[PDB]
PDB file of C-alpha atoms and ligand atoms in Angstrom:
ATOM      1  CA  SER A   4      -0.781 -20.662  -8.440  1.00 13.68           C
ATOM      2  CA  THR A   5       1.791 -22.515  -6.126  1.00 12.85           C
ATOM      3  CA  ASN A   6       4.402 -20.867  -7.941  1.00 12.77           C
ATOM      4  CA  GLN A   7       3.791 -17.047  -7.384  1.00 13.97           C
ATOM      5  CA  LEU A   8       3.135 -18.844  -3.783  1.00 17.64           C
ATOM      6  CA  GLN A   9       6.589 -20.046  -3.781  1.00 18.54           C
ATOM      7  CA  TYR A  10       7.804 -17.171  -5.019  1.00 17.49           C
ATOM      8  CA  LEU A  11       6.192 -15.126  -2.442  1.00 20.33           C
ATOM      9  CA  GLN A  12       7.698 -17.579   0.506  1.00 22.30           C
ATOM     10  CA  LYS A  13      11.419 -17.934  -0.847  1.00 22.42           C
ATOM     11  CA  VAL A  14      11.951 -14.290  -2.488  1.00 22.37           C
ATOM     12  CA  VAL A  15       9.158 -11.687  -1.533  1.00 22.37           C
ATOM     13  CA  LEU A  16       8.890 -12.515   2.576  1.00 22.15           C
ATOM     14  CA  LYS A  17      12.550 -13.374   2.652  1.00 18.79           C
ATOM     15  CA  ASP A  18      13.901 -10.503   1.307  1.00 19.12           C
ATOM     16  CA  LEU A  19      11.865  -8.361   3.635  1.00 19.79           C
ATOM     17  CA  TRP A  20      12.838 -10.496   6.619  1.00 21.98           C
ATOM     18  CA  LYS A  21      16.723  -9.532   5.509  1.00 24.14           C
ATOM     19  CA  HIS A  22      15.569  -5.766   5.464  1.00 23.66           C
ATOM     20  CA  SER A  23      17.481  -3.827   8.381  1.00 24.42           C
ATOM     21  CA  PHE A  24      13.593  -2.322   9.115  1.00 26.63           C
ATOM     22  CA  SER A  25      12.196  -5.742   9.509  1.00 27.96           C
ATOM     23  CA  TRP A  26      12.483  -6.288  13.320  1.00 29.54           C
ATOM     24  CA  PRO A  27       9.144  -4.353  14.427  1.00 28.97           C
ATOM     25  CA  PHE A  28       7.074  -6.527  12.055  1.00 29.46           C
ATOM     26  CA  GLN A  29       8.502 -10.164  12.641  1.00 30.33           C
ATOM     27  CA  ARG A  30       5.826 -10.940  15.194  1.00 30.57           C
ATOM     28  CA  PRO A  31       2.294  -9.609  16.048  1.00 32.51           C
ATOM     29  CA  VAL A  32       2.108  -6.061  17.723  1.00 35.09           C
ATOM     30  CA  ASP A  33       2.024  -6.793  21.036  1.00 36.84           C
ATOM     31  CA  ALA A  34      -0.313  -4.052  22.341  1.00 34.59           C
ATOM     32  CA  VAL A  35      -0.325  -4.920  26.065  1.00 32.38           C
ATOM     33  CA  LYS A  36       3.365  -5.412  26.028  1.00 32.71           C
ATOM     34  CA  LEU A  37       3.499  -2.324  24.418  1.00 32.48           C
ATOM     35  CA  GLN A  38       0.716   0.017  26.274  1.00 33.56           C
ATOM     36  CA  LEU A  39      -1.149   0.706  23.389  1.00 32.25           C
ATOM     37  CA  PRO A  40      -4.731   0.605  24.835  1.00 32.79           C
ATOM     38  CA  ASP A  41      -6.982   1.499  21.306  1.00 34.22           C
ATOM     39  CA  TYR A  42      -4.861  -1.187  19.019  1.00 32.46           C
ATOM     40  CA  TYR A  43      -7.197  -4.187  18.974  1.00 29.94           C
ATOM     41  CA  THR A  44      -9.993  -1.727  18.938  1.00 29.40           C
ATOM     42  CA  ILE A  45      -9.178  -0.130  15.747  1.00 28.25           C
ATOM     43  CA  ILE A  46      -6.885  -2.392  14.101  1.00 25.59           C
ATOM     44  CA  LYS A  47      -9.569  -5.350  12.901  1.00 24.54           C
ATOM     45  CA  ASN A  48      -7.323  -7.725  11.218  1.00 19.93           C
ATOM     46  CA  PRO A  49      -4.068  -7.438  12.829  1.00 22.66           C
ATOM     47  CA  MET A  50      -0.986  -8.772  10.658  1.00 23.88           C
ATOM     48  CA  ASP A  51       2.542  -9.185  10.603  1.00 21.83           C
ATOM     49  CA  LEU A  52       5.303 -11.198   9.260  1.00 21.54           C
ATOM     50  CA  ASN A  53       5.185 -14.231  10.905  1.00 23.09           C
ATOM     51  CA  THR A  54       1.973 -14.807  10.576  1.00 22.43           C
ATOM     52  CA  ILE A  55       2.203 -14.535   6.486  1.00 24.96           C
ATOM     53  CA  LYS A  56       5.129 -17.086   6.947  1.00 24.92           C
ATOM     54  CA  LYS A  57       3.053 -19.755   8.989  1.00 26.60           C
ATOM     55  CA  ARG A  58       0.149 -19.298   6.978  1.00 25.89           C
ATOM     56  CA  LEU A  59       2.062 -19.682   3.623  1.00 26.36           C
ATOM     57  CA  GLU A  60       4.199 -23.057   5.059  1.00 27.15           C
ATOM     58  CA  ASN A  61       0.879 -24.165   6.385  1.00 28.24           C
ATOM     59  CA  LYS A  62      -0.719 -24.009   2.759  1.00 29.24           C
ATOM     60  CA  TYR A  63      -3.384 -21.616   4.144  1.00 30.12           C
ATOM     61  CA  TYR A  64      -3.585 -19.516   0.998  1.00 29.45           C
ATOM     62  CA  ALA A  65      -5.760 -20.971  -2.088  1.00 29.92           C
ATOM     63  CA  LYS A  66      -4.385 -18.506  -4.247  1.00 32.62           C
ATOM     64  CA  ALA A  67      -1.038 -15.310  -4.149  1.00 30.06           C
ATOM     65  CA  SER A  68      -3.698 -12.552  -4.013  1.00 33.01           C
ATOM     66  CA  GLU A  69      -4.604 -13.611  -0.380  1.00 29.98           C
ATOM     67  CA  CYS A  70      -1.076 -13.597   0.708  1.00 30.48           C
ATOM     68  CA  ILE A  71      -0.624 -10.373  -1.418  1.00 33.09           C
ATOM     69  CA  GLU A  72      -3.561  -8.788   0.761  1.00 32.13           C
ATOM     70  CA  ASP A  73      -2.268  -9.325   3.787  1.00 33.71           C
ATOM     71  CA  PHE A  74       1.102  -8.305   3.406  1.00 33.87           C
ATOM     72  CA  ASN A  75      -0.971  -4.706   2.265  1.00 33.53           C
ATOM     73  CA  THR A  76      -2.809  -5.531   5.573  1.00 36.97           C
ATOM     74  CA  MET A  77       0.151  -5.044   7.479  1.00 35.18           C
ATOM     75  CA  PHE A  78       1.164  -1.881   5.645  1.00 36.65           C
ATOM     76  CA  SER A  79      -2.035  -0.073   5.753  1.00 39.47           C
ATOM     77  CA  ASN A  80      -2.339  -1.203   9.760  1.00 40.76           C
ATOM     78  CA  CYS A  81       0.740   0.691  10.307  1.00 41.33           C
ATOM     79  CA  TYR A  82       0.150   3.529   8.279  1.00 43.43           C
ATOM     80  CA  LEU A  83      -4.048   3.460  10.026  1.00 41.21           C
ATOM     81  CA  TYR A  84      -2.603   3.450  13.266  1.00 39.69           C
ATOM     82  CA  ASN A  85       0.367   5.580  13.428  1.00 40.58           C
ATOM     83  CA  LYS A  86       1.171   9.336  12.383  1.00 40.26           C
ATOM     84  CA  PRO A  87       2.990  10.447   9.448  1.00 37.35           C
ATOM     85  CA  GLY A  88       7.011  11.014  10.353  1.00 35.43           C
ATOM     86  CA  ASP A  89       6.975   8.429  12.770  1.00 33.89           C
ATOM     87  CA  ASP A  90       9.558   6.211  12.476  1.00 34.09           C
ATOM     88  CA  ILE A  91       7.877   2.685  12.384  1.00 33.68           C
ATOM     89  CA  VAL A  92       6.024   4.416   9.371  1.00 31.45           C
ATOM     90  CA  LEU A  93       9.284   5.488   7.858  1.00 31.27           C
ATOM     91  CA  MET A  94       9.995   1.839   8.289  1.00 33.26           C
ATOM     92  CA  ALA A  95       6.698   0.334   6.916  1.00 32.12           C
ATOM     93  CA  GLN A  96       7.357   2.368   3.773  1.00 34.38           C
ATOM     94  CA  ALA A  97      11.144   0.840   3.074  1.00 36.88           C
ATOM     95  CA  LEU A  98       9.516  -2.531   3.521  1.00 40.82           C
ATOM     96  CA  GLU A  99       6.682  -1.519   1.191  1.00 42.07           C
ATOM     97  CA  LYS A 100       9.238  -0.290  -1.812  1.00 42.28           C
ATOM     98  CA  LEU A 101      11.129  -3.535  -1.311  1.00 44.80           C
ATOM     99  CA  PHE A 102       7.819  -5.279  -1.250  1.00 46.10           C
ATOM    100  CA  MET A 103       6.815  -3.585  -3.886  1.00 44.81           C
ATOM    101  CA  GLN A 104       9.719  -4.246  -6.308  1.00 45.49           C
ATOM    102  CA  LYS A 105      10.048  -8.058  -5.617  1.00 47.19           C
ATOM    103  CA  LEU A 106       6.277  -8.083  -6.749  1.00 47.87           C
ATOM    104  CA  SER A 107       7.403  -6.796  -9.997  1.00 49.07           C
ATOM    105  CA  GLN A 108       9.338  -9.158 -10.637  1.00 51.18           C
ATOM    106  CA  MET A 109       6.622 -11.793 -10.029  1.00 52.12           C
ATOM    107  CA  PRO A 110       6.662 -14.763 -12.108  1.00 51.93           C
ATOM    108  CA  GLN A 111       3.651 -15.719 -14.427  1.00 49.05           C
TER     109      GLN A 111
ATOM    110  CA  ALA B   2      10.895   0.963 -24.732  1.00 49.59           C
ATOM    111  CA  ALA B   3       9.773  -2.038 -21.836  1.00 45.63           C
ATOM    112  CA  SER B   4       8.882   0.999 -19.407  1.00 47.01           C
ATOM    113  CA  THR B   5       6.818   2.597 -22.123  1.00 50.10           C
ATOM    114  CA  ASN B   6       4.869  -0.434 -22.538  1.00 49.53           C
ATOM    115  CA  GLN B   7       4.469  -0.745 -18.531  1.00 47.35           C
ATOM    116  CA  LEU B   8       3.889   2.893 -18.533  1.00 46.65           C
ATOM    117  CA  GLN B   9       0.636   2.225 -21.278  1.00 43.21           C
ATOM    118  CA  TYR B  10      -0.502   0.016 -19.429  1.00 44.53           C
ATOM    119  CA  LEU B  11      -0.371   1.531 -15.801  1.00 48.10           C
ATOM    120  CA  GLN B  12      -1.855   4.964 -18.064  1.00 46.71           C
ATOM    121  CA  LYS B  13      -4.608   2.994 -20.036  1.00 49.26           C
ATOM    122  CA  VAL B  14      -5.882   0.460 -17.568  1.00 48.91           C
ATOM    123  CA  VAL B  15      -4.683   0.651 -14.043  1.00 51.46           C
ATOM    124  CA  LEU B  16      -5.656   4.423 -14.284  1.00 57.65           C
ATOM    125  CA  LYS B  17      -8.560   3.996 -16.382  1.00 60.08           C
ATOM    126  CA  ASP B  18     -10.261   1.571 -13.993  1.00 61.82           C
ATOM    127  CA  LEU B  19      -9.590   2.942 -11.007  1.00 60.08           C
ATOM    128  CA  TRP B  20     -11.088   6.042 -12.347  1.00 57.99           C
ATOM    129  CA  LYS B  21     -14.254   4.253 -13.358  1.00 53.32           C
ATOM    130  CA  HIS B  22     -14.847   2.884  -9.750  1.00 47.32           C
ATOM    131  CA  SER B  23     -17.686   4.296  -7.829  1.00 45.22           C
ATOM    132  CA  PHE B  24     -15.249   5.163  -5.175  1.00 44.93           C
ATOM    133  CA  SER B  25     -12.604   7.517  -6.920  1.00 47.71           C
ATOM    134  CA  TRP B  26     -14.498  10.762  -6.874  1.00 47.61           C
ATOM    135  CA  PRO B  27     -12.215  11.941  -3.878  1.00 47.70           C
ATOM    136  CA  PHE B  28      -8.940  10.921  -5.087  1.00 48.70           C
ATOM    137  CA  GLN B  29      -9.601  12.655  -8.429  1.00 48.37           C
ATOM    138  CA  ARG B  30      -8.218  15.744  -7.566  1.00 50.41           C
ATOM    139  CA  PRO B  31      -5.930  17.063  -4.959  1.00 52.58           C
ATOM    140  CA  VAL B  32      -6.767  17.176  -1.503  1.00 55.57           C
ATOM    141  CA  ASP B  33      -7.610  20.858  -1.534  1.00 58.63           C
ATOM    142  CA  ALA B  34      -7.092  21.557   2.242  1.00 57.82           C
ATOM    143  CA  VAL B  35      -8.018  25.378   2.214  1.00 54.65           C
ATOM    144  CA  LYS B  36     -11.630  23.774   0.882  1.00 53.62           C
ATOM    145  CA  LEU B  37     -11.665  21.261   2.998  1.00 51.60           C
ATOM    146  CA  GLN B  38     -11.068  23.429   6.301  1.00 50.12           C
ATOM    147  CA  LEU B  39      -8.200  21.024   6.850  1.00 48.83           C
ATOM    148  CA  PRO B  40      -5.636  23.149   8.984  1.00 47.08           C
ATOM    149  CA  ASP B  41      -2.599  20.394   8.879  1.00 44.67           C
ATOM    150  CA  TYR B  42      -3.109  18.311   6.045  1.00 44.89           C
ATOM    151  CA  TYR B  43      -0.243  20.240   3.735  1.00 43.89           C
ATOM    152  CA  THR B  44       2.147  20.242   6.966  1.00 46.35           C
ATOM    153  CA  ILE B  45       1.987  16.711   7.850  1.00 44.68           C
ATOM    154  CA  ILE B  46       1.561  15.050   4.160  1.00 48.77           C
ATOM    155  CA  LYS B  47       4.817  15.899   2.431  1.00 49.29           C
ATOM    156  CA  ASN B  48       4.085  14.813  -1.130  1.00 47.99           C
ATOM    157  CA  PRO B  49       0.381  15.251  -1.999  1.00 45.78           C
ATOM    158  CA  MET B  50      -0.656  12.581  -4.522  1.00 44.08           C
ATOM    159  CA  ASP B  51      -3.947  12.166  -6.343  1.00 39.82           C
ATOM    160  CA  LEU B  52      -5.030  10.478  -9.318  1.00 41.67           C
ATOM    161  CA  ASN B  53      -4.786  14.273 -11.783  1.00 42.40           C
ATOM    162  CA  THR B  54      -1.434  14.140 -10.983  1.00 42.89           C
ATOM    163  CA  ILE B  55      -0.704  10.832 -11.904  1.00 40.67           C
ATOM    164  CA  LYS B  56      -2.700  11.326 -14.875  1.00 41.25           C
ATOM    165  CA  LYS B  57      -1.241  14.593 -15.930  1.00 39.41           C
ATOM    166  CA  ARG B  58       2.596  12.922 -15.104  1.00 37.39           C
ATOM    167  CA  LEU B  59       1.725   9.685 -17.684  1.00 34.82           C
ATOM    168  CA  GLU B  60       0.366  12.136 -20.126  1.00 30.49           C
ATOM    169  CA  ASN B  61       3.486  14.609 -20.234  1.00 31.37           C
ATOM    170  CA  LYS B  62       5.564  11.677 -20.593  1.00 31.74           C
ATOM    171  CA  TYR B  63       7.133  12.396 -16.779  1.00 30.85           C
ATOM    172  CA  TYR B  64       7.860   8.887 -15.366  1.00 29.84           C
ATOM    173  CA  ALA B  65      10.768   7.270 -16.788  1.00 28.32           C
ATOM    174  CA  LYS B  66      10.281   3.991 -15.214  1.00 28.48           C
ATOM    175  CA  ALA B  67       6.843   2.517 -14.297  1.00 29.15           C
ATOM    176  CA  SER B  68       8.257   2.254 -10.511  1.00 29.28           C
ATOM    177  CA  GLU B  69       8.560   5.630 -10.448  1.00 28.54           C
ATOM    178  CA  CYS B  70       4.298   5.846 -11.164  1.00 27.15           C
ATOM    179  CA  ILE B  71       3.677   2.859  -9.085  1.00 27.51           C
ATOM    180  CA  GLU B  72       5.542   5.024  -6.059  1.00 27.70           C
ATOM    181  CA  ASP B  73       3.190   7.558  -6.825  1.00 27.51           C
ATOM    182  CA  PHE B  74       0.096   5.275  -6.615  1.00 27.40           C
ATOM    183  CA  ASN B  75       1.232   4.066  -3.367  1.00 29.36           C
ATOM    184  CA  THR B  76       1.697   7.371  -2.203  1.00 26.73           C
ATOM    185  CA  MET B  77      -1.760   8.584  -2.709  1.00 24.96           C
ATOM    186  CA  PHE B  78      -3.144   5.610  -0.460  1.00 25.52           C
ATOM    187  CA  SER B  79      -0.430   5.929   2.256  1.00 27.22           C
ATOM    188  CA  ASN B  80      -1.246   9.605   2.812  1.00 29.82           C
ATOM    189  CA  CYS B  81      -4.924   9.072   3.280  1.00 27.84           C
ATOM    190  CA  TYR B  82      -4.370   6.261   5.579  1.00 28.75           C
ATOM    191  CA  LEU B  83      -1.545   8.273   7.408  1.00 29.81           C
ATOM    192  CA  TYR B  84      -3.549  11.631   7.775  1.00 27.97           C
ATOM    193  CA  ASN B  85      -7.277   9.935   8.687  1.00 30.29           C
ATOM    194  CA  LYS B  86      -8.202   7.287  10.708  1.00 27.28           C
ATOM    195  CA  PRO B  87      -9.342   3.389  10.726  1.00 31.12           C
ATOM    196  CA  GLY B  88     -12.920   3.277   9.527  1.00 35.12           C
ATOM    197  CA  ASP B  89     -13.391   6.721   8.023  1.00 32.81           C
ATOM    198  CA  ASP B  90     -15.098   6.275   4.992  1.00 33.43           C
ATOM    199  CA  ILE B  91     -12.737   7.880   2.939  1.00 34.81           C
ATOM    200  CA  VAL B  92     -10.198   4.724   4.220  1.00 33.86           C
ATOM    201  CA  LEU B  93     -12.642   2.624   3.320  1.00 37.94           C
ATOM    202  CA  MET B  94     -12.812   4.241   0.172  1.00 37.11           C
ATOM    203  CA  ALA B  95      -8.759   4.171  -0.653  1.00 36.22           C
ATOM    204  CA  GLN B  96      -8.961  -0.021   0.496  1.00 34.52           C
ATOM    205  CA  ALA B  97     -11.173  -0.887  -2.402  1.00 34.72           C
ATOM    206  CA  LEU B  98      -9.362   0.990  -4.480  1.00 35.31           C
ATOM    207  CA  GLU B  99      -6.191  -0.120  -3.655  1.00 34.20           C
ATOM    208  CA  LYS B 100      -7.347  -3.817  -3.955  1.00 37.86           C
ATOM    209  CA  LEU B 101      -8.580  -2.857  -7.556  1.00 38.41           C
ATOM    210  CA  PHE B 102      -4.958  -1.046  -8.073  1.00 36.83           C
ATOM    211  CA  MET B 103      -3.108  -4.503  -6.906  1.00 40.09           C
ATOM    212  CA  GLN B 104      -5.345  -6.905  -8.859  1.00 38.71           C
ATOM    213  CA  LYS B 105      -4.573  -4.788 -12.000  1.00 36.98           C
ATOM    214  CA  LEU B 106      -1.498  -4.550 -10.837  1.00 38.23           C
ATOM    215  CA  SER B 107      -0.789  -8.370 -11.251  1.00 33.94           C
ATOM    216  CA  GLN B 108      -2.182  -8.440 -14.826  1.00 34.94           C
ATOM    217  CA  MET B 109       1.036  -5.980 -15.592  1.00 34.98           C
ATOM    218  CA  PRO B 110       2.796  -7.607 -19.063  1.00 36.77           C
ATOM    219  CA  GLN B 111       5.804  -8.639 -17.378  1.00 37.90           C
ATOM    220  CA  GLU B 112       8.446  -6.581 -19.860  1.00 41.00           C
TER     221      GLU B 112
HETATM  222  C1  LIG C 201       3.853  -2.719  13.170  1.00 42.86           C
HETATM  223  N1  LIG C 201       4.238  -1.901  14.306  1.00 42.86           N
HETATM  224  C2  LIG C 201       5.168  -2.387  15.522  1.00 42.86           C
HETATM  225  C3  LIG C 201       5.572  -1.807  16.456  1.00 42.86           C
HETATM  226  C4  LIG C 201       6.408  -2.421  17.347  1.00 42.86           C
HETATM  227  C5  LIG C 201       7.420  -1.532  17.731  1.00 42.86           C
HETATM  228  C6  LIG C 201       8.503  -2.313  18.738  1.00 42.86           C
HETATM  229  C7  LIG C 201       8.570  -3.336  19.146  1.00 42.86           C
HETATM  230  C8  LIG C 201       7.151  -4.328  18.902  1.00 42.86           C
HETATM  231  N2  LIG C 201       6.960  -5.519  19.418  1.00 42.86           N
HETATM  232  C9  LIG C 201       8.278  -6.399  19.340  1.00 42.86           C
HETATM  233  C10 LIG C 201       7.519  -8.315  19.639  1.00 42.86           C
HETATM  234  C11 LIG C 201       6.202  -8.031  19.969  1.00 42.86           C
HETATM  235  C12 LIG C 201       6.104  -6.406  19.701  1.00 42.86           C
HETATM  236  O1  LIG C 201       4.926  -5.866  19.418  1.00 42.86           O
HETATM  237  C13 LIG C 201       6.243  -3.465  17.785  1.00 42.86           C
HETATM  238  C14 LIG C 201       4.473  -0.601  17.193  1.00 42.86           C
HETATM  239  C15 LIG C 201       4.889  -0.407  18.398  1.00 42.86           C
HETATM  240  C16 LIG C 201       4.021   0.968  18.350  1.00 42.86           C
HETATM  241  C17 LIG C 201       3.204   1.716  17.564  1.00 42.86           C
HETATM  242  C18 LIG C 201       2.945   1.061  16.316  1.00 42.86           C
HETATM  243  C19 LIG C 201       3.892  -0.108  16.134  1.00 42.86           C
HETATM  244  C20 LIG C 201       3.158  -0.988  14.494  1.00 42.86           C
HETATM  245  O2  LIG C 201       2.929  -0.468  14.220  1.00 42.86           O
HETATM  246  C1  LIG C 202      -8.018  11.276  -0.555  1.00 42.85           C
HETATM  247  N1  LIG C 202      -9.082  12.739   0.326  1.00 42.85           N
HETATM  248  C2  LIG C 202     -10.161  13.012   0.150  1.00 42.85           C
HETATM  249  C3  LIG C 202     -11.003  13.988   0.781  1.00 42.85           C
HETATM  250  C4  LIG C 202     -12.163  14.509  -0.269  1.00 42.85           C
HETATM  251  C5  LIG C 202     -13.242  14.282   0.467  1.00 42.85           C
HETATM  252  C6  LIG C 202     -14.396  15.014  -0.289  1.00 42.85           C
HETATM  253  C7  LIG C 202     -14.162  15.645  -1.124  1.00 42.85           C
HETATM  254  C8  LIG C 202     -12.157  16.474  -1.715  1.00 42.85           C
HETATM  255  N2  LIG C 202     -12.087  17.240  -2.851  1.00 42.85           N
HETATM  256  C9  LIG C 202     -13.161  17.334  -3.873  1.00 42.85           C
HETATM  257  C10 LIG C 202     -12.399  18.248  -4.881  1.00 42.85           C
HETATM  258  C11 LIG C 202     -11.165  18.781  -3.829  1.00 42.85           C
HETATM  259  C12 LIG C 202     -11.240  17.952  -2.737  1.00 42.85           C
HETATM  260  O1  LIG C 202     -10.562  18.178  -2.002  1.00 42.85           O
HETATM  261  C13 LIG C 202     -11.753  15.755  -0.464  1.00 42.85           C
HETATM  262  C14 LIG C 202     -10.687  14.259   2.455  1.00 42.85           C
HETATM  263  C15 LIG C 202     -11.606  15.015   2.905  1.00 42.85           C
HETATM  264  C16 LIG C 202     -10.822  14.859   4.230  1.00 42.85           C
HETATM  265  C17 LIG C 202      -9.846  14.146   5.335  1.00 42.85           C
HETATM  266  C18 LIG C 202      -9.238  13.259   4.153  1.00 42.85           C
HETATM  267  C19 LIG C 202      -9.466  13.636   2.618  1.00 42.85           C
HETATM  268  C20 LIG C 202      -9.075  12.645   2.356  1.00 42.85           C
HETATM  269  O2  LIG C 202      -7.698  11.847   2.331  1.00 42.85           O
HETATM  270 CL1  LIG C 203      13.345   0.239 -20.493  1.00 43.33          CL
END
């Protein structure tokens, strides 16, 4: 559905980006820059808001469910790599909460 | 009453179908950290959550909104991801359940 894909692009992604905690998720985790020796090894499918945004712009997704899967991968990647109480985890959870709320207002 | 309809859906459809999934069994009761010999689980997982706790809260009309129940579901999953490691079987198992959760959430009656 291009309608749901449009909502994910114009509402969900925009609103997550506006959130004050979005900045660490705004581009791929650059494991060389951040000195994370194991990240590319154990996180099999890195994902971020900018990749999702480019894919929606390029009409890469066929259904909204594939775009939603990328959002969930971005969040679970962060939980899987990090530890409870980490600040990055606290930011991801606030973003996931917002994501979960805006999905509840998805049309169709 | 719109919250009630969505909570009925969460109870009778989403929770039921996750429970039916072959990978649901480790999530059907709270993680028993004593039984499982997990010395740090209760220390670092601040709000443990499981399918039986959610089932009981739905049966006891504990939630006021569907969003509060959805929060417990997400807590169940992120707890698992946060405590465990990428590639763990329990993580693969939660990811399958989480995918089903999002699929059934997509058919939630907009009320
Ligand atoms: C989602 N996420 C994000 C960051 C993270 C923090 C600060 C900065 C950046 N930036 C900025 C541009 C490129 C870049 O990588 C990423 C991170 C750092 C250490 C461990 C885990 C994570 C993580 O899981
Ligand atoms: C969600 N989850 C579940 C289990 C897990 C596996 C097998 C059995 C049980 N059971 C059965 C009855 C009580 C009980 O605790 C829990 C687990 C084990 C080790 C580390 C993490 C986890 C985890 O994160
Ligand atoms: Cl209501």
